[PDB]
Amino acid sequence: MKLFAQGTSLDLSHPHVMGILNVTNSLIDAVKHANLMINAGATIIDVGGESTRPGAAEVSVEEELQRVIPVVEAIAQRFEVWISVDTSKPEVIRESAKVGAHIINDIRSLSEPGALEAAAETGLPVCLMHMQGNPKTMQEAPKYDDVFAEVNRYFIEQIARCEQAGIAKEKLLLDPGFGFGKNLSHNYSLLARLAEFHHFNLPLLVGMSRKSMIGQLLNVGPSERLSGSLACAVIAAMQGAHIIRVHDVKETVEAMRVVEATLSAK
Template structure:
C-alpha cells in the first residue's frame, strides 16, 4: 500500500512516525512554543532528524475550550510554515485543519495530507478536499473538539465507531475521494480510550485494513503502543 501526493510516494508497508507541529498559542502540549516561523522550522528540523517522516502542521487548537480562529489567522499561521518545510525537508506534510480555504491553500503550499478532526464536516470542506486530490485523514469523535472529552458514552463502542467510519467513507467516495486515499483515526487521545475498551483496538486494525487499508492514529502513551503491537514489555 502506498500513498501518492504532490509527486511524492509514501510507502505504507511499514509504520511511520509523525511529528506534531502546533503553530498556535494555546495547543494542548506545546502551545506557544513554535508559533514563530523560525521556531517552527527549528522544531521541524529536530523532528526530522529524530526520524519523523511526516510533519503535521496545525494552526488552530482543538483542545476543549480553545478559542476559534478566523480563516485569515489560520492561513497566516500555517501557510508560511508549510512552505518553509516543503522547501527545506524531504518529508511528507499534513495540515491539521477543517476549513476549506485552508485546505486549498495548504495544497498549493505543498501539503501532502489533509488531517481533519471533523472529518470534512464543515461547509465546503468535503468539496475542497476532493478538489485537491490529496489523501485525507478522518477522525472519529463524539460531538465537537470542545465537547468530545465530556464523558463520551457508547452502548457498543466498536460498532458505533465502525458505523461512523463506514458513513464517512461513503460520503468521501460519493464526493470523488477514492477509498485508497483515506486514512482512519479512531482517536486514541480521547477519554474514550480506557482499559475497558482498549481490546477493541486490535479489532479496529482488522476493520480498517478491510475497509480502507490505511489507519492513522495518534499514540501518545508508551504503554498503549506496547499493547497495540502485541508486546507487553516496556517500550
C-alpha cells in the first residue's frame, strides 16, 4: 500500500509517525521544530494554523495563509519529508499544493464550500476524518446509537462523495477522529474496533496524542500524558493503523519499531 504526491511516494508497509507542527520569528522556529521531528524519525509533518478546541478563534483565510504557506514551502525546500496540511479552506488547500504539500488533512472532510473541488484539482491524497457536529459544540453532548456503525456509515458516504468529484479511492485516507464529538466511552469503542475499518482497503490515520480520552482516564494534564499516548499509538498500530499523529515523535517512533518487529514476526 502506497501514496503518491509531488513526484515521490510514501510506502505504508510499516507505521509512519506524523509529527504535529502548530503555527500559532515564527518561521525560524517552525523550521527548527520540523528538523528535530525529522531527526527523531517523523516521516510526515502536519502543519496547522487553526486550533480545534471549542473557544478557538475562527482564523481568517488571510491569517491562515500567512502562517501556513511559508512553513510548508520552507519545509519542502529544505527536507525530503512529506507534508500534511491541516486546513479546511480551499485557498489554503490550493496554495499549499503549489508550494509542495503532499496530503490534505481536513478535520471537516472537505465540507466547506469549494474545498471538495479545490482538493480534487490538486490531485493530492486526502484524509477523511469523522466529526459529529463542529469544533465549538461537538463535545457538549455527543450521542450515538452505535458509534462504530455510524462512523463506518460516514466513511461509506464520504468516499462516494469524494469519488463523485473525481477524487479516486486510492487518494483517500480514513480517520475515526478521536475526540471529535465523542465521549470517553465512544473513543474507546472506536479504538477497540479500529481494525474493522480495514475493510475499505484504505490507509487508516489516527490522532490520539495527549488527548482528553487519555486525560480523563489518568486524571492528569496534557504534559503528563505521554505513557497513555504511547499506549494509544501502540494499540492502533498493532491493529494495522498506517499513520499515527503525535506530539512526541522520538518516543512514538521507538514504540513503532517494537510494533513493527512484532508485526513482522506474526
